[model samples]
Target: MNIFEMLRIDEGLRLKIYKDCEGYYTIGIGHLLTKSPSLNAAKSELDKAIGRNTNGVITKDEAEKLFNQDVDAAVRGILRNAKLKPVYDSLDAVRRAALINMVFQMGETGVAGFTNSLRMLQQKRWDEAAVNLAKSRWYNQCPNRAKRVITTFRTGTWDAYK
Candidate 1:
């Protein structure tokens, strides 16, 4: 499924996905944060948050609720899913989850398209992978999303992962 469908995202919601009062927050999108209760619970909560926030009119509070629910579950799903099993299994949990979050934002096919990138990752070729990621079509279109992943790959650190 396309990212819009897979994540149940829409233009309206995408426009509102951002940080707010509670914490790093977004509307109609799942966010897996560190210190989340459980993976399943987090993802479920994010789904519910998205559903509730976008039911009619999107609101920050509504989105926060959704984020509170399933962000962790979504993270858990990404790490353990069949598609990600290959790459994720080879990395540390923090790095793995960070990559999965990027893939979650970008979708499976988008992640799978990272053949050269995967090789670079395996070799610890962080700079090359970061460059490759920045050159992607997705990157061109979604600089902020690309920024997070590229930054993570380069620094070997992720804010959300911490």
Candidate 2:
């Protein structure tokens, strides 16, 4: 229904710290910690957020705090990318969300690597953009989510929910 809801469902909820499919340490709703501070600091922050140490597990509210921060970073990265910003700005709400979702699913640099898809989006060639995305390694890795995102990009609607 909303960007947050879509991301939460796609990312799934986890109470305890676990490794993602790529073997990166992740927790909560796709909160990736592999690129940052050590696990001790991670647990420390989780404790700070929840006002008590939860050991390795986290509550929904605690998870939401981290999820919100991740969303901000994803949006910020998309806006900061010189190649993607203009195209992102040109899109409507639905299409804009598709871009944000992709940026969130993969990092800015990862999305940036999809040069042909980005170009197609910039030209408003929705079908071509979808085709390009469907052919990506990302699609093969997370086919269901990728299909929804691809549909959103192509239809310029909240097709992901359907």
Candidate 3:
């Protein structure tokens, strides 16, 4: 594969701030900060800036820049699910968002392992796909978030988690 494509697979993409293996501040395709404060310190800095005790912070402009820089990688990450590509493409925005969220939460390999669910999606079985998703280990890992994804897959709309 070409360098760009390889980077897309290796780095993936993250629109939101995350922690790397070493727990350093990172964002946008595994772009770790060379010199960064602890997570608490970073949150404190953001809290002071926004006048709220938030977990993290970034302006829309900054988020836009980060997404623009890494969008190709992110799309590549989503499209890497070759078996489900057609199904994914056929989905509405909300349903597509749910699948994308699955990839982000579980990574390409993890999502690929959802063979039954992918097959359900391939057959255009919306409720079956949602049920398969809800039956996964990921669901047990995070029920509330998984339920939201399930709801999105089934209804093709954003379902806020309580």
Best candidate per lDDT, number? 2
**Residue 85, candidate 1: C-alpha displacement in angstroms:** 1.7
The model with the greatest TM-score is 2
User: CA lDDT of 2 in candidate 3?
Assistant: 29
What tens-digit string does per-residue lDDT give for candidate 2 at 1-162? 778988887889999977765666678998876644467766766676667868879888888988898899999998899988988988988888888898997889999889888988999999888888899778887788888889989998775686
Error in Å for residue 110 of model 1: 2.5
> Which residue pairs in model 2 clash with each other?
none
- For residue 53, give model 3's deviation from the true position in Å: 22
Q: Give one digit per residue, the lDDT tens place, for model 3 in 3-120.
A: 2333344445665567754456765554444336676665665455446554564555554455444544445777765765776788766667667666654567778788888878
* Residue pairs that clash (backbone atoms under 3 angstroms), model 3: none
State in Å the error of residue 157, model 3.
Answer: 1.8
**TM-score per candidate, chains pooled:** 0.56, 0.86, 0.56
Q: Which candidate order results from sorting by TM-score in descending order?
A: 2, 3, 1
In Å, residue 63's CA in model 3 sits off its true spot by 7.0
Model 2 superposed RMSD (Cα): 2.7
Model 3 off-target regions past 4 Å? 1-72
1 or 3, which is superior by lDDT?
A: 3
Candidate 2 — number of clashing residue pairs?
Answer: 0
**Angstrom error at residue 85, model 2:** 0.4
Backbone N/Cα/C clashes per model: 16, 0, 0
